[PDB]
Structures are given as C-alpha cells and as structure tokens.
Amino acid sequence: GKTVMEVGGDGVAVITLINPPVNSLSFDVLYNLKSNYEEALSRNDVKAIVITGAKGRFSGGFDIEPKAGYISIDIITDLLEAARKPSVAAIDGLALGGGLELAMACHARISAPAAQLGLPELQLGVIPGFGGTQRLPRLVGLTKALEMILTSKPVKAEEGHSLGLIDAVVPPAELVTTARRWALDIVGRRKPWVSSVSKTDKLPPLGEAREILTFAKAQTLKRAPNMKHPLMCLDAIEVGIVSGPRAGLEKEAEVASQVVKLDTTKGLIHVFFSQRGTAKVPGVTDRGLVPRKIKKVAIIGGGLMGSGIATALILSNYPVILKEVNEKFLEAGIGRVKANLQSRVRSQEKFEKTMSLLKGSLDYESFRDVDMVIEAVIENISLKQQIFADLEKYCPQHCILASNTSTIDLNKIGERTKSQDRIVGAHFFSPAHIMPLLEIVRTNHTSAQVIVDLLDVGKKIKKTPVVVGNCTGFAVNRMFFPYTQAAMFLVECGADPYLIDRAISKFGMPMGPFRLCDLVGFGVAIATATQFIENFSERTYKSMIIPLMQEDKDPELKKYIEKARSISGVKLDPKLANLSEKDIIEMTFFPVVNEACRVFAEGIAVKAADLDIAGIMGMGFPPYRGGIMFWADSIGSKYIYSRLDEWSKAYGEFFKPCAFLAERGSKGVLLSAPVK
Numbered sequence: 001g002k003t004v005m006e007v008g009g010d011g012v013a014v015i016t017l018i019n020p021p022v023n024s025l026s027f028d029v030l031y032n033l034k035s036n037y038e039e040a041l042s043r044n045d046v047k048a049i050v051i052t053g054a055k056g057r058f059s060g061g062f063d064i065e066p067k068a069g070y071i072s073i074d075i076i077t078d079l080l081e082a083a084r085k086p087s088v089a090a091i092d093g094l095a096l097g098g099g100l101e102l103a104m105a106c107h108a109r110i111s112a113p114a115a116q117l118g119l120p121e122l123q124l125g126v127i128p129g130f131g132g133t134q135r136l137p138r139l140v141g142l143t144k145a146l147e148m149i150l151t152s153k154p155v156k157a158e159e160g161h162s163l164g165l166i167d168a169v170v171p172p173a174e175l176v177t178t179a180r181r182w183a184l185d186i187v188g189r190r191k192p193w194v195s196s197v198s199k200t201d202k203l204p205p206l207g208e209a210r211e212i213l214t215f216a217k218a219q220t221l222k223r224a225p226n227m228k229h230p231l232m233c234l235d236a237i238e239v240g241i242v243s244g245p246r247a248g249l250e251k252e253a254e255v256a257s258q259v260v261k262l263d264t265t266k267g268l269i270h271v272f273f274s275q276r277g278t279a280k281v282p283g284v285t286d287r288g289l290v291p292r293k294i295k296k297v298a299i300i301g302g303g304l305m306g307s308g309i310a311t312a313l314i315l316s317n318y319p320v321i322l323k324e325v326n327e328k329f330l331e332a333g334i335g336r337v338k339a340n341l342q343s344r345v346r347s348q349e350k351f352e353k354t355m356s357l358l359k360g361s362l363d364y365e366s367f368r369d370v371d372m373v374i375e376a377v378i379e380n381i382s383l384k385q386q387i388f389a390d391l392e393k394y395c396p397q398h399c400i401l402a403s404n405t406s407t408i409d410l411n412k413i414g415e416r417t418k419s420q421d422r423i424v425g426a427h428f429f430s431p432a433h434i435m436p437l438l439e440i441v442r443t444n445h446t447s448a449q450v451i452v453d454l455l456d457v458g459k460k461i462k463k464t465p466v467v468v469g470n471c472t473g474f475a476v477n478r479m480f481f482p483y484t485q486a487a488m489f490l491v492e493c494g495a496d497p498y499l500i501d502r503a504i505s506k507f508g509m510p511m512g513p514f515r516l517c518d519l520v521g522f523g524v525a526i527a528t529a530t531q532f533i534e535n536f537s538e539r540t541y542k543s544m545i546i547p548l549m550q551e552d553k554d555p556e557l558k559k560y561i562e563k564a565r566s567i568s569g570v571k572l573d574p575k576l577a578n579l580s581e582k583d584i585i586e587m588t589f590f591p592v593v594n595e596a597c598r599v600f601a602e603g604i605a606v607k608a609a610d611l612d613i614a615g616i617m618g619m620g621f622p623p624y625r626g627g628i629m630f631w632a633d634s635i636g637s638k639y640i641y642s643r644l645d646e647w648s649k650a651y652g653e654f655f656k657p658c659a660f661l662a663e664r665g666s667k668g669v670l671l672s673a674p675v676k
Contacts, residue, residue, distance in 0.1 A: 001063075003032040005040070011047035012180040013040045022060025023053040025098040025130075029063075034075050041083055048183035049083075051106060052090035052176055059099025061120070069253025072130045076105045077249060081195055086186040090179040091115050092172050096154060101130035104139060104196050107186060109165065110179045111157040112172040117165060118154030124272055125229050125265025125624065129256035133236040134248045135196040140165050142204055142241075146216050149237075150230060164202065197245045206242065213238045226508055227624050229259050263634070267626035271616060274609035274627065279455055281467045281606050284448045291456030292398075292449070294371040298323065300387055301376030302333025305404055308432025309374055311340045314357040315433065316461045321359045321366055334360050340433060364394035372400040372457070374426050379406065379527075384413045392417040400450055402426040406477070407531045410443050410470050420445035424454060427474060429618060437617040438463040443470045466614050469604040472535040473528075475611065476618040479599060479628065481532045481540070482591040482654075483619075484525065487513035488543035489654070490587060491565055494577030498557055503581035504588060508622025513588065518555075522546050538653055544568040587655075590644050593632040593671075594658055600629070601660035601675060608672035629672045641665025 001019020008014065015036050017023040040046045053059055065071050080087060089095075089103040091111040100117050103109055111117070119128050119136065127133065128149065137145035140163040148155065160166040170178045185191035203209060213234060220230045232255045240248020259265060279285065299310045302324040310333075313320045324330035337358055341351040359366075367373070373395060375387050384405065391401055401422045403413055414423040425441025438458045442451055451467060458465035468475040491497050491514075501512020509516075517525050526546050533540045545568045579587070596611050605611050612627020625631040632640060641662060647655035657665065664671055 001026050001029045003029055003036060005036045007046055008180065010180060010184060011045055012050055012183055013046050014050045014052065014176060014180065017051070017053040017059055019063070022094065023057055024061050024063040025059055025102065026063035027065070030071055030075065034079065037079055037083065041085055046085065047187050048085050049087040050090055050176065050179045050183055051087060051102070052179070053092065056172060057093035058089070058091040058095040059102060060094055061097035061099055068257045069249055072253055073249050076102065076130055077197060081105045081197060086183055086193060088179040088183040090175045092175055097121055097128065098130050101128060101132040101135070104135035105131060107194055108167045108182050110168050110170060110175055110182060111160065111166045112175055113157060113169060115157040116154040117157065117160045118152070119149050120152045120154070122149060122230060122233065123152045125227065125259070125262060125268035127229060127233040127236065127252065127256050127259055129252060131197065131249060133233060133252045134240045134245055137237060138199045138202055139196055141202045142209055142212055146212070149233065150216065150220065203241060209241050226622065227264050229262060229265060232259055264624035267624045267630060270626045270630050271612065271623045274613050275464060277607070278464060278466045278610050278613055281451070284451050284467070285455070287448055289449050289452045292453050294453065294457060295319065296370050298367055298370040298373045299376060300373065302329050303376060304336065305428065305430060305432060306376035307333045307336035307340070308430060309376060309404065309428060310358060311337050311433040312461050314354050317357065319357050321361055321370070323361050323364070327362065330360050330362055334358065364390055367394040368396065370395060370399055372402060374402045374404055376404040379408055381408055381412060384408060385416050388414050388423070389416040392419045400424065400453060402454065404428055407528065410441060421447040422450060424450050425470065426454060436464050437476070437614065438465045439474050439476060440465050440467045441470055441474050442467055464613065464617055466610045467606060471604055472531055475599055475605055475614050477528060478532065479596050479611065479615060480592060480619050481529060482595050483588060484513050484517055484529070485541045485543065486588045486591050488545055489541050490576050491545070492543060492568060492571050494573040495579060496577065497561070500584050503584040507585050508625060510620040522550050541654060544570065586643065587647065590640055591655060592628060593640055594644060594661055596628050597661045597671060598658045603675070633670050633672050636668070637661065637665040637671050638668040
C-alpha cells in the first residue's frame with residue numbers, strides 16, 4: 001500500500017493511510033510514512049501533522065526492518081512521537097494492533113462513535129511490536145491494558161474515551177476537521193502536549209504494579225499452560241514499568257523477534273489462514289457463481305436439534321418457519337427457541353422482535369414461499385424419504401432441500417424425488433446456536449450453485465463452513481470415531497481411564513475421552529458410533545463398557561467403574577496400563593490422524609487445512625497445535641507410520657496404517673501435501 005500527504009492552508013499536514021482492505025501497516029506504508037514525517041518536519045509551511053485512514057478506516061493491523069525495533073523505536077517513538085511538531089490521529093472504523101499502536105504514538109486521538117480499538121496480537125501467538133506493551137498501560141491503566149492484551153478483545157471508541165485512550169468522540173464527518181483543530185491547539189498551547197510513552201499518571205505504584213503483573217502471570221499459567229507468548233508479553237510490560245519506557249521498548253522488540261519462532265505461534269498462524277480458506281472449494285467456487293438471496297427458511301423438526309437451527313437463523317434476521325406433527329410437539333419446539341433467547345438476555349426489544357421472525361405451522365402450504373428447507377427429524381430413513389417427497393411437492397422449484405441428518409446417506413433421503421441437484425447436507429453440532437462449525441455435505445449430484453448458496457448462509461450466521469463429501473460420518477464425526485474406541489480398548493487392557501482423561505485434557509483438549517463421552521450422553525455417543533461399527537467393522541472396536549452401564553442406568557472418580565470394565569472382559573490385559581502420557585495421547589490420536597488421511601485421500605475433504613479447522617472447531621483440538629493434520633506433520637509421517645505399524649502388528653488392524661499414510665510415511669514426505 002501507500003500513504004498520501006496534503007498540507008492545508010492552516011499548515012497542517014494530513015497523512016492518509018491507503019492499503020485496502022483495512023489499511024494494514026505494511027512496511028511500504030510505514031516507509032512512506034517515515035518519508036512523510038521527514039518532509040513535514042523540514043517544511044516551514046508545516047506546523048503539525050494529522051494521521052487518518054482511507055475509506056472510513058484508520059488501520060486494521062499488520063499486512064498479510066534493520067534492527068529488531070527499528071520501526072517501534074526509531075520511526076514511531078523517536079521520529080514521530082518525539083518530534084517538535086504535534087501529531088493527531090483521526091480514527092474511524094477501526095484501530096487494531098499496529099493500527100492502534102501508531103495512534104497511541106500520536107499526541108492526541110480523535111475517533112468516530114463506534115470505532116474499535118484493541119490489540120488482538122495474542123490471538124495469533126504474537127505480541128504488540130510497535131510500543132503497545134508500553135503505551136496502552138500508560139493510557140488506559142495497567143488493569144485494563146492487561147485485560148485488553150490478554151483477552152485480545154477490542155473496545156469501542158466510547159468506552160475508550162472514558163478510559164483516556166480516546167481524547168474526543170465526534171461524527172465521522174468532523175473527524176479530520178476536529179483533528180487539525182486539535183493539532184493547532186497543541187501548537188498554540190490551548191491544549192496539552194502529551195507523550196504517551198513517558199506518561200506515569202495512570203500506572204500503579206512500582207510495588208503494586210509488580211503485584212498485578214505477578215498475579216496475571218500466575219493465572220495465565222493456570223489457564224493456558226500450553227502457550228508461552230502471553231508470559232513473554234507480560235515480561236515486556238513489566239520491564240517497561242520497572243526499568244522505564246525505553247528499556248521496555250527494546251525488551252518488546254526482542255520478545256517480538258523470538259515469539260515468531262515458537263512452534264505454537266506457527267500453529268496459531270496456520271489456524272488463522274486455514275479458517276479463511278474453508279470457503280475455497282475448487283470446481284465449485286471458482287466458476288463465477290454468486291450466492292442467491294435466501295429470504296425465508298423452513299425448519300422441519302421442532303426437536304432439540306431443529307429448535308437450535310431456528311435460533312441461529314432468526315438471530316441473523318432470517319424469517320424461519322417450523323413445521324411439526326402434533327400441536328404439542330410444535331408448541332414444544334417454539335418453547336425451546338424462546339428459552340434459548342431468554343437465556344442470553346440474563347437487549348429486551350431485541351429478543352422480542354426476533355421472535356416475530358419465527359412462525360409456527362403444522363402444514364406445508366406455507367412452504368410455497370420458502371427459499372431453503374432444513375430437515376432435522378429423528379434418524380429414520382423411511383420417515384426422511386417421505387419428508388423430501390412432500391418437500392419436493394409443496395416447495396418452489398428453486399428451494400434448497402437441505403438435511404441436518406448425521407447417520408443417514410443423503411442419496412437415500414432423496415430417493416423418492418427427482419431433485420438430487422437440490423439436496424444438500426447442512427450438518428450442525430449441538431448446541432446449534434453456539435457451535436461455530438457447519439458441515440456442508442455435498443453429493444455427486446449437489447449443484448455447485450446450491451453449495452455456493454449454503455456456503456454463504458453459513459457465513460451470514462457467524463458459522464465457519466467446511467464443504468465435505470457424502471460418506472459415513474462425513475468429516476468431523478468420522479475423524480474422531482477412533483478417538484473414543486482407542487481409549488476404551490486401552491481401558492479394557494487395564495489402562496486407568498482417569499489417567500487417560502487427564503493426559504489428554506492437558507494435551508489441549510477441553511475434555512477427556514471418557515469425560516466427554518459422559519457429557520455427550522451415553523445414548524448419543526453409542527448411537528453415533530453404531531454408524532461406523534457397521535461400515536468399517538474391521539477398523540472399529542465395540543466396547544461393551546457403555547452398554548453394560550446403560551442397562552444398569554461437579555463430577556468425581558467412581559469407585560464402581562472398575563467392576564464395569566471387567567465385565568466387558570473380552571480382551572486380555574497387557575502392559576497398556578502404566579503407559580506414559582505421551583503414549584496415551586499417541587495411541588489415541590495417531591489412529592485419528594490415520595483416519596484423517598483416509599478422509600483426505602478419498603477426497604472427502606478438499607484440503608488438509610480444512611481437516612485442521614474441522615477437528616479444532618468441532619472437537620476442540622488445540623489451536624496452538626495447528627490442527628490434527630498440521631500436528632501430524634509436526635511430528636513426522638515416518639514416525640507416525642513406524643509407530644502405527646508396531647501397534648498394528650501387536651494389537652490388530654485397528655491400528656493398521658492406511659495406504660495413503662503408509663506410502664507417504666516411508667518416503668518421509670508431508671501428509672498435508674495436496675493429493676496427486
């Protein structure tokens with residue numbers, strides 16, 4: 001990108017940051033800025049400087065330097081902030097990361113009403129590298145700065161104004177005018193000439209600041225023991241407070257140049273891009289098609305999963321209509337919806353107007369206007385086939401015939417119709433309105449235009465869509481089905497279940513295999529596993545543990561579990577008990593890698609990076625580990641292969657490497673590499 005500078009008749013130089021989409025601070029922009037300043041501070045006709053962004057946006061961050069802190073220190077701190085001419089930032093839209101830092105370097109800040117200000121760097125496993133670790137705590141206080149930097153959450157201009165981050169809030173149309181007026185106020189001493197970096201007004205006493213910093217470090221190691229960058233960022237903050245500002249800067253410059261080398265930040269960076277690339281499906285989204293406008297959606301369900309969908313839809317101003325069989329089931333579903341909205345109330349007129357979008361019905365005549373249908377009925381083929389027969393009958397010819405099915409082949413559902421091009425899989429994960437993932441299941445017949453449509457609806461409802469193929473368990477569930485079975489096989493072999501959970505919950509998972517198995521509900525976990533037992537028998541293990549518990553009907557260990565596993569004694573008891581935490585993880589996750597490769601090779605998933613996001617966003621796989629596939633290559637295919645074969649030749653074909661993994665593992669090549 002670039003920057004344009006123009007000197008008004010009042011002597012104020014206005015510099016516009018120009019680098020779409022969000023005017024990120026590329027080196028290009030920065031060096032143009034440097035030149036701008038060197039000129040402005042040499043021109044006699046220039047009195048002060050104002051900085052603003054193009055197209056109603058200040059700067060969204062860094063683009064996607066000689067020393068370590070050449071910019072932070074030499075350009076931003078010395079050249080700009082320590083200049084003998086005042087700078088004023090004119091903020092509109094957003095000021096995030098480097099964008100917010102550049103603004104903090106200025107001597108005053110004018111902002112438009114609802115602009116966003118924050119330092120999101122930590123979410124990428126990186127740190128503020130332009131002086132944010134210094135100026136933020138000095139402008140808003142240590143307590144707030146710590147919250148913003150650690151939580152990575154942005155703040156609106158209004159709140160920013162009351163914190164001392166923003167000096168004034170004016171309408172977007174007065175932004176630059178106010179700023180240049182402010183700039184000449186400073187030159188004329190009608191207003192203070194403050195340097196943020198050497199401001200102590202807002203800091204706590206040296207001793208208490210250490211108490212606040214110590215505390216933070218402590219609880220950051222309690223929640224996120226896995227990542228180091230936050231603590232590394234807290235270091236830069238403490239140094240700046242104790243040893244002074246200039247020491248703090250160089251400390252940040254050092255921390256920033258080494259934090260990029262961490263293996264977990266490469267993982268976090270990979271997850272960032274992979275999140276974006278899930279909507280790129282070759283042969284579908286490269287055709288020049290454009291999403292259709294869906295103005296009305298029908299949800300045939302009313303049950304738990306159905307009521308969830310409806311919630312997500314109306315929450316995004318989608319007129320939704322539920323159809324049920326009996327009046328009871330209908331009034332029941334509508335009830336769950338309201339309950340879901342009332343929950344997040346504890347606006348009012350908000351969650352009262354969105355209830356008008358939801359309209360009930362026990363008929364099909366109200367489908368003559370629907371642009372998309374989602375069926376969320378019990379997993380009964382006979383019944384689903386019938387629903388799609390009626391759908392094809394009462395619906396418009398363009399209407400999308402989507403199903404939330406989880407265990408039934410999409411091709412069999414549309415058996416009684418001739419609308420195979422309109423039938424697609426819209427797979428949600430309960431709770432439908434919280435789980436961020438959406439599996440768009442395409443068939444051989446699903447038309448590209450329908451996928452492009454759904455792909456767009458997913459984005460509209462704050463979901464992250466992946467386009468997967470039609471097969472047993474699609475991508476997410478099929479991927480992690482070995483997970484639970486590998487665990488239970490280890491248990492039947494003597495392995496302590498609670499050790500398993502602890503080893504894996506510390507690995508990065510939000511839960512343990514068994515711990516999560518209880519949360520999902522034995523009835524559900526066993527119902528979704530059946531699918532794979534019947535389609536991949538020679539690769540699955542039906543542990544009688546759960547069933548035996550079902551027939552007998554703030555959580556802690558159960559002294560009555562030992563007798564339960566013993567009863568399911570079909571296998572013997574090796575030395576799989578007393579395994580290392582590394583081994584537990586390796587025997588529980590490598591089979592998942594193995595399955596991910598089958599999915600990737602079979603073409604079920606478009607690209608490895610999609611599998612990463614899927615496992616991450618569907619099964620809470622550790623983001624800092626990049627994803628199930630990124631992690632697999634992080635260890636090495638040759639290792640995973642060699643280790644997975646040793647088990648195959650010692651426990652059964654369950655651990656046997658699939659052709660794709662084997663062929664690649666031997667050559668020591670990357671697994672995430674495109675299929676050829």
